[PDB]
Nucleic acid binder design. Sequence first.
RNA 1: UUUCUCUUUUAUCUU
RNA 2: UUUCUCUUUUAUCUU
RNA 3: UUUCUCUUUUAUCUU
Lengths: 109, 329, 329, 328, 328, 329
Amino acid sequence: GQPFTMDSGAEATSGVVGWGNMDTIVIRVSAPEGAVNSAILKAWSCIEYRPNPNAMLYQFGHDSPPLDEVALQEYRTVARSLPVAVIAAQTASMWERVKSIIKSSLAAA
Amino acid sequence: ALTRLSQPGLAFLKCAFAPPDFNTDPGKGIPDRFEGKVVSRKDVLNQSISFTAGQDTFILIAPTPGVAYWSASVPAGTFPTSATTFNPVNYPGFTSMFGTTSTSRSDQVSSFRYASMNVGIYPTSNLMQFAGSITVWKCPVKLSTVQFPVATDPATSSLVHTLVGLDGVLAVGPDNFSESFIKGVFSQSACNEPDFEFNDILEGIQTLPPANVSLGSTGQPFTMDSGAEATSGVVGWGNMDTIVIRVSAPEGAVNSAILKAWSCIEYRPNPNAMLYQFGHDSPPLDEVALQEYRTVARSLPVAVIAAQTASMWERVKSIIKSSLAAASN
Amino acid sequence: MAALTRLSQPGLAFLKCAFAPPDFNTDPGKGIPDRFEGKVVSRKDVLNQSISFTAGQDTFILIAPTPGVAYWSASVPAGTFPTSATTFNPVNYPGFTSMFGTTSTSRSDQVSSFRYASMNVGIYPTSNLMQFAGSITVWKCPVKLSTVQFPVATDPATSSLVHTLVGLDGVLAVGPDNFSESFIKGVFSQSACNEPDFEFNDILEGIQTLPPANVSLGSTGQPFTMDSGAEATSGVVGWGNMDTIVIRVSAPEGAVNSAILKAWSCIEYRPNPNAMLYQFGHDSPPLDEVALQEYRTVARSLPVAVIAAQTASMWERVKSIIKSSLAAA
Amino acid sequence: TRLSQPGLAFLKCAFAPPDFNTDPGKGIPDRFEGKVVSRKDVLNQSISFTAGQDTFILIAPTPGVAYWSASVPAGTFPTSATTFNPVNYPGFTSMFGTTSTSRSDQVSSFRYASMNVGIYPTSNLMQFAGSITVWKCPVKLSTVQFPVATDPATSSLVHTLVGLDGVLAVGPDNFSESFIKGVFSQSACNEPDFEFNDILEGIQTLPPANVSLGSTGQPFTMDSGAEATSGVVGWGNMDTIVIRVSAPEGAVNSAILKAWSCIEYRPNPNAMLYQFGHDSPPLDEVALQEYRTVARSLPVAVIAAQTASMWERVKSIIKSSLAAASNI
Amino acid sequence: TRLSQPGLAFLKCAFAPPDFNTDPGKGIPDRFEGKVVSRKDVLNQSISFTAGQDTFILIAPTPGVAYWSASVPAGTFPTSATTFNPVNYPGFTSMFGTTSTSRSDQVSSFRYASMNVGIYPTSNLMQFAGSITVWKCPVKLSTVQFPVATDPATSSLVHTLVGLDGVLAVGPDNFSESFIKGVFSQSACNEPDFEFNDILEGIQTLPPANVSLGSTGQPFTMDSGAEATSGVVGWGNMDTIVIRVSAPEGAVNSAILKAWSCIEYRPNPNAMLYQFGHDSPPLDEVALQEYRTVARSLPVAVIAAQTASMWERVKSIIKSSLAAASNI
Amino acid sequence: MAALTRLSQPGLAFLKCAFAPPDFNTDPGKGIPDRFEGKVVSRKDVLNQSISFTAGQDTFILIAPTPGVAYWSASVPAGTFPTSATTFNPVNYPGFTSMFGTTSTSRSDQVSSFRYASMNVGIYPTSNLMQFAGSITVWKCPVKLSTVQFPVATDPATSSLVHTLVGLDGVLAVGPDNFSESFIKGVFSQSACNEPDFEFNDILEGIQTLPPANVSLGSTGQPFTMDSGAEATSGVVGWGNMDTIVIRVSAPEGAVNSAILKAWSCIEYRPNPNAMLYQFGHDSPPLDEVALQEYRTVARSLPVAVIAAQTASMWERVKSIIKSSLAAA
RNA sequence: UUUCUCUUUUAUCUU
RNA sequence: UUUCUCUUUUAUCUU
RNA sequence: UUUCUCUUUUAUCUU
Ligand SMILES: [Ca+2]
Ligand SMILES: [Ca+2]
Ligand SMILES: [Ca+2]
Ligand SMILES: [Ca+2]
Ligand SMILES: [Ca+2]
Ligand SMILES: [Ca+2]
Ligand SMILES: [Ca+2]
Ligand SMILES: [Cl-]
Ligand SMILES: [Cl-]
């Protein structure tokens, strides 16, 4: 039923280790004929893993943070509030745009 | 002043002449005498599109449900010929309403009627590479039929769907908007009838002329091919004039852009459809809005540059208040 | 009140032929009060029929805007809906032949076109309290008569086009907006113009079956079939602008469900100067803005159907809605 | 309230005599205000009626064609063995080309506003004989569905005019008077609104080519002939006027026939006619209800004598109903 | 006060020209509001008058029959040796079957509202000769009682038309003018109220079969002929119009005759006509006294020229009496 | 305001066809509101033309009151003006032939006379910001069509008389009253009746060149020549009462100047009873004192030309001047 | 089809 | 296309 | 992300 295919290639270089609970961001980038479109692409991922006692990874582990009712409801609000995407320009103005939405909805409470 | 319009009657005028990027429920419906159950479908297309140099690309905003526009390119300085075929670009979820076979369109809905049909072209190329123009006019394209005989055994007479008025695309209408490509454009169409009558959903249509029909028998100047019955098709023809857009890209010109299309359509849902869940009664008659609609439409320019897409709603309100003023005297 | 005095005699009669019970409405009214005032012939069709339902079988009844035919029925296995294997047979109003002849090509001999005003139906149980069983479900489908286009491998190869009933698929599911009570409680319901205005429809020649002769159900998209039978007894003379009333009547095994079935139809025809009908014609009623807006309101206001019990209380329920909405104006 | 300039003009093109330099006007005052081109079609036809014949002239809402004429032996009406031939308005070809597929080349659709007709006897007073009779028919263009035993077997659907059977008899609502007295009559929109009808391609005959008159139900035939001189470009929503000029034996019946037609067409941007186009007049409720009233009030037809006292008949009705409604 | 829609329509069907697309209307505005079916019967008859003959046309309140015609030598009137033959309105059979006992099959009773007649000369201006004369007769359908020597001896009672002797002379109150000028005339209810009359079964001739014209008193005979083509279905309460077209020798008198008839019938539940039925209009005192007044005021008949200036004659009288009564 | 309500529908339309942009004016108006009310045919001529300018050459465009021809052009050496060695070639409005035949002696076949109402023109640059160069200068000349008288040494000797364009000499200098901005900024300008009233002008037969065939430029005084070419494609059918718009477009060497050129013409003709044109005619609009004085004022008030940019802002700029001068009255 | 308050809770029109 | 004062500085109409 | 009125116009909570 999948409309297209996903190939990670040589098992020795890449592969599909799992599938998280985050909607998938889709991006169409139209390049006309004779157009030079050069850019830098960045990607963030805050992931929390369960380290295997054997892994040379484990020594960097710690305990998950305690429940923060506030932060969780803020997260949800900010999330649903923010726009699909913004222009690269206001990437820095982002943190601020956020801090705004927080005080705005935490004020009406 | 704009308080003489019913809530919907106003909403109606907005879905109509303004690009409601604003997330209202998509339109209320039409403030006409009809108040039966309908579903206001707000169709919207966002298509990135690069224009090939040395070609005069033609785009048709037709009142064909489920399809935002049809295009094809002809060599620069020329228009479509018999040798031309237009391919449709569907709004999202075409199949989700009309199925995947030319005989399953009337499955979800039975009839329809357009309310708005807007389109905008927003240039994305730089100021050193673009070149060319965007020309726009509107054609009274209706969907009739052609009657001709066939030498079969026994010999018989045929009758098939044929598009009348297409010949209007072979020339730049006098009533037109023409300006530099880079300036983009926004334009909308309106009901080419005195009222908002419903049209039936058409089964089986995939091409015009229809398969097995020689072009010219119909008298059409070119062809319409929706392609695979499982991906697109022609489900009906609304009572809106078709919008013609000629984008001539000179040689070596990098003209890219983003095209947007809006369509408020009232469909009559079928009880067996899930879609039916979102049906409501059509808005009650709003004599004022119906009289304004007509006035606003007649006033507005053929089209305007992309920039004035915003000032659109405002331009409208002023035309209205200006009309409601003369009504007091 | 001050609402019943704003209406013209015609305007009032109109509203009665539309929602009033058959007995109260002794006067069909001079017709439809609208812009049209040409020569017409008002004919109030009424069918009374003692019918007994087949036990262990659900019987479906379709009321459609077809001139000279009250309804169409078909029985299917209990708990099921029509299938491709299903075919509906029409029951004619008295004197169908005296109106549309006896040959599929002599329908337009008496009248050329028509337009429906009211189209009601009622079921009055006559079973005793020791024999009744089952339920009566009712919903309405927006069935319209369109056309389908497809190619044919003949010699030479050609493209066809024939009549198709669009939105018939709605009959295969009980839409959320429905009436549904125990058989014994009967049911009463009407239908109204599914168009903003009352436009005339042409009389259709040669139509006997749908899909028509030599056409596979497959190529039409219609979920089931319509057969009027011998051209000499019945047939499909046209298709009006009224949503179609659908009725599922479940009869359990060993249940005696006897009832009387009634049907109303206020139709306005265009008499042919030659017809022995013409001498009964008169001019269509003048426009009655009020009556028209009342009609629309009452229509959208009334419930899908009501139990047979409150068939008489109907006229009153109506007269209520009128003063209620004409008071807030 | 009062009428608009266009709303008044509209009522004149509608029932006004054409000798009044009638203004096509800007068109029809209704909700529609779209671009359109107004055409005032006028035909003057000198014509002699065959003695011992009953000539039948039909005014139909067929664009570019003034009328269809056929003749049958005195005392009879058209039969299956009859075929009506159209007389085109001036410049038919300049509008709908010369092919049965060149109609929609200049205009895509249309709608009629008026459709009048007049017959002015030119015979002396002893030579003439016979009578003129008029009635109108609600002839509409439908479709017929019948099967055909081809390989493989198929079903055929085609155009068929309904309500023609009304021409085979003299409608009760009719005008009937001596030939010499002439006649004038007009038709009106047979629909509640003035909707647009499309232009029709390929129609040259009805029954069409390869169809028996039996398959259609139509009582007789319609032939426009050479697709290069005439044809059926569409069927409007106007009742069709029927005129039966009964000429007896040894009767010299000569006369002139005029045909009026106010039509609003939707011009194709590419057509030359587009420059002439303007916008349909704004809705004028008054005129739209006057039109409807005047129409219902006027007689089927009148002798050619009262062709000038026509406009005054109307002005009278206009203020006689603008009077029963002006009091309260 | 003013008239109702039906009360106005009623006055039009009554004296209004039929070229006005006259509305049958809902019927008669009187105390009665019962279910009925309005029928507007119209006949157009092309007819040539025998030279040296005096043709007598009688408009009688016989349903389904436009008129009865008989001819006698110029200068004479009908005699015992005369028989009048009826010309039926269209679809006579569709209403009263094909048996002398199938009349009451569709409708049980009836009552006339209007009964007009017109004659429109189609002759040229030198060929024609003669004159048209009109007067009306209070012909009513009674009964005659005479004994018959059978075994045993018995008494016989049968229908007999009274007041026919009035056709054997030209009533003083009459219209008389040149043939060519044509003529138009109408009749009115000869009773104070519009009561219903029953449909009559078995009547084909008067005197009936087996009765001598001597037994009836009737001056001449009435024959409808084949019970399968015509017959006498009833006699209404309208005075009978008499028209004497006097054609001399070598006179070519051709013309068209029209006959109007607004009738209200009580439909049988089983009849197809029942669907078309509505309720008689509510009593409209105004119209009922206007009808009565207009009637008495109007002339016996008028030349066919003033057939259109008829409606205006009425509108005039309507407000000229609504004026002598509007002051105080 | 109270100014826009004093005008008749015609009076308003008139003012728009005159100064309004081509897109806003979808309705040409019933014509000129003045004393004349006879039968006429309003024809709004519109030319759209993609034109590229020759580099290193100044191109001159002349807009004249000639029926069926939009403009006349000719290119000359940069920095220079026309000379005796110069000849202007006309560009026809669509369907010139369908109006004035194909032979210099069949111009008055469709129409006998005419009179101009509006005569606008606009230039919309389509070059990118890396390729445009040059300037657009505009002024107006009072060119009128007169006659010249001179003797001829024939046998016997005779005196001639032929058409001459008077005041053509004005095209050889940029008058103090002028528009003149960078090419890229485009330009928009109209022209108006150079007479106190709108008198009709006759259609002129046989005119193909000026100086005409067999006449030396010397004997006419005209500074340069006018050649319409093949009588079968173009020609000079008459000369209206509108000042002629002159346009100098300087294109530097190596500069890519591409633009769209538009032209308006509201002309009122006297249709010949025979013409297949006549059926579109109507009566001239009634006198509208207001509209006429407004016209004059607006005209004299508006600037020579404006940049292409404010072509839309035009209609508004106008509506301003009206209320301003109609307020002080 | 009945009666209002109350806060709702969205939604535009206006500064 | 916007707002007035001020003196401008010509210019006629009126005694 | 900013400011209120106004009528909106739906929507429940309560008598
Ligand atoms: Ca899938
Ligand atoms: Ca309609
Ligand atoms: Ca074509
Ligand atoms: Ca289907
Ligand atoms: Ca038939
Ligand atoms: Ca006697
Ligand atoms: Ca000079
Ligand atoms: Cl029964
Ligand atoms: Cl171009």
